[PDB]
Amino acid sequence: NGIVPDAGHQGPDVSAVNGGTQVINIVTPNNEGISHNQYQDFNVGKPGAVFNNALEAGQSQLAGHLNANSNLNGQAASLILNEVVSRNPSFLLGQQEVFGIAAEYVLSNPNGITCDGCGFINTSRSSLVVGNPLFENGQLKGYSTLNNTNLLSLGKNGLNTTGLLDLIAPRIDSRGKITAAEISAFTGQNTFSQHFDILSSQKPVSALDSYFFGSMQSGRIRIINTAEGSGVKL
Amino acid sequence: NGIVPDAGHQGPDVSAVNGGTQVINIVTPNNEGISHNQYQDFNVGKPGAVFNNALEAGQSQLAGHLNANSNLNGQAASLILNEVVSRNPSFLLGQQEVFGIAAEYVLSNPNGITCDGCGFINTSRSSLVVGNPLFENGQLKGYSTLNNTNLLSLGKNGLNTTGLLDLIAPRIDSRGKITAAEISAFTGQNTFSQHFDILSSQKPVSALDSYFFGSMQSGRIRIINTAEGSGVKL
């Protein structure tokens, strides 16, 4: 029970198959294609987790055979946005798979996110955001790390994906191998568009220092730090 | 005598002022604005070096009062390209200043470049290239690190500039603080345009691994590695 959905309209259906792998029947996407899922707790263990973004039955890598997700009503998500709405931080200790149609993935948790041996399957882009999504008039407008000093931590067992990776947080502390098609890390207290264009920045009350130990196995790495003064240590 | 010009038409006039600071009266720019300077040896010590890109007399930061560079014939360089044509590697242990009109700066040395406490004054962009410039029909076409396995080393005393910085080499080993408006590092065996667009890449015969210790004090960092397999260690 690492993943606990919110009790309201944006809480997805969450269950487990034998062996403990979590299966999330994501909520119906809006007209922009965004499935906005809210959680009281979001954690993934070694058994992993599967997001059902399928319009037809078939074979998932981590959870066996699954039906189509009835919640989709015939249109798959373009973006699976997972938002933790409580004060609980997230720990990602295994693989997350999008079953069915490949999608963009976001986990937002302003309380902190820790990856250690996590990874992403069948995602075009995966973004970890220690911050909150911003909505206006029911549409996703972007994200915010303003007034937040919490950490995106990546542990010794690293993070792997064949897709694009975004790491968005007030500060990042990475100690393992990050493997991705491209890595984009954006640190500081910022607001962002839906596509992680930086729209504004503010100077933190005290330093927000980020640390990258370990390695990065990617053909394209970008690190953008807006906290004037604060550093990027390697 | 850290800097020794080539004896031919692209060798600039090199001298020293009291205290040992080197002064380079760069060669006449071509119609594109490129002053292409060739050297048998190019090294900078603690006293530093000043490139005279001035159309009028005035005060340099490192070498006192200087006349205009008569070699310019009334048009300053847009790019000061310094090319080592021998087998000697380069050591940069102090500041390099463009006196007069701010310009882009390039040092190319396919034998290796080591920075340790080096820096750049009055440059819009400074690029260190462990590789060769490419010319066709007398015009600069870009740069090459093909078939080269040599190192761009940055030592414990680091590198500072208020301008843009490019680090171009088969491999980079950095152990100090790099301070720049933006840092772009491109590793592997590549060809480049004049503006460091990657045009081609080849897989090295054996691994070309790069290492970034220390820190990077810059709002925008990009690291592009084309050596398929080889890593970026932090």
SS3 of chain B: the string is CCCEECCCCCCCEEEECCCCCEEEECCCCCCCCEEEEEEEECCECCCCEEEEECCCCEEECCCEEECCCHHHCCCCCCEEEEEECCCCCEEECCEEEEEECCEEEEEECCCCEEECCEEEECEEEEEEECCEEEEECCEEEEEECCCCCCEEEECCCCEEECCEEEEEECEEEECCEEECCEEEEEECEEEECCCCCEEEEECCCCCCCEEECCEEECCEEEEEECCCCCCEEC
Answer whether B214 sits within 8 Å of A231, measured CB to CB.
no
Answer whether B224 sits within 8 Å of A223, measured CB to CB.
no
CA distance B57 to B73: 14
Q: Which of B217, B226, B234 shows the shortest C-beta gap to A219?
A: B226
Interacting residues of B67 by C-beta distance below 8 A, sequence separation 6+: B54, B57
CA torsion B60-B62-B63-B64 (nearest 10°) is 50
Q: What CATH class does B1-234 carry?
A: mainly beta
Answer whether A216 sits within 8 Å of B222, measured CB to CB.
no
Cβ distance B151 to B189 under 8 Å? Answer: no
β-strand B90-92 against B79-84: which pairing, if any? unpaired
Name the resolution in angstroms. 1.4
CA B157, B161, B167: angle at the middle one, nearest 5? 80
CA torsion A208-A209-A215-A216 (nearest 10°) is 40
Cβ distance A231 to B217 under 8 Å? Answer: yes
CA distance A86 to A72: 26
CA-closest candidate to residue B23, choices B74, B56, B61: B61
Residue A81 Cα to chain centre, angstroms: 8
CA distance A198 to A187: 10
Distance from CA of A214 to the nearest CA of B (A): 5
Query: Residue A233 has which token pair?
Result: 């240590």
Chain A residues with beta carbon closer than 8 angstroms to that of B220: 222-224
Task: Identify the helix (H) or strand (E) that includes residue A188.
Answer: none
Amino acid at A166: D
Q: What is the DSSP letter of A44?
A: B
Distance from CA of A82 to the nearest CA of B (A): 28
CA distance A170 to A144: 10
Distance from CA of A14 to the nearest CA of B (A): 38
The residue of chain B with its CA nearest to that of A225 is: B219
Cβ distance A15 to A52 under 8 Å? Answer: no
Query: Residue A111 has which token pair?
Result: 């309380």
CA distance B11 to B50: 16
Q: Is A120 exposed, middle or buried (0-12, 13-18, 19+ CB in 10 A)?
A: buried
CA distance A202 to A192: 12
CA distance B200 to A13: 49
Answer whether A224 sits within 8 Å of B224, measured CB to CB.
no
The residue to which tokens 């014939």 are assigned: B73
CA A215, A221, A227: angle at the middle one, nearest 5? 95
Cβ distance A219 to B224 under 8 Å? Answer: yes
Task: Identify the helix (H) or strand (E) that includes residue A227.
Answer: none
CA distance B219 to A231: 9
Distance from CA of A89 to the nearest CA of B (A): 26
CA–CA distance from B18 to each of A231, B54, B129 (Å)? 38, 20, 30
Q: Is A182 exposed, middle or buried (0-12, 13-18, 19+ CB in 10 A)?
A: middle
Query: Residue B102 has which token pair?
Result: 């701010």
Cβ distance B133 to B143 under 8 Å? Answer: yes
Chain A residues with beta carbon closer than 8 angstroms to that of B225: 218-219, 221
Q: Quick check: helix, strand or coil at residue A160?
A: strand
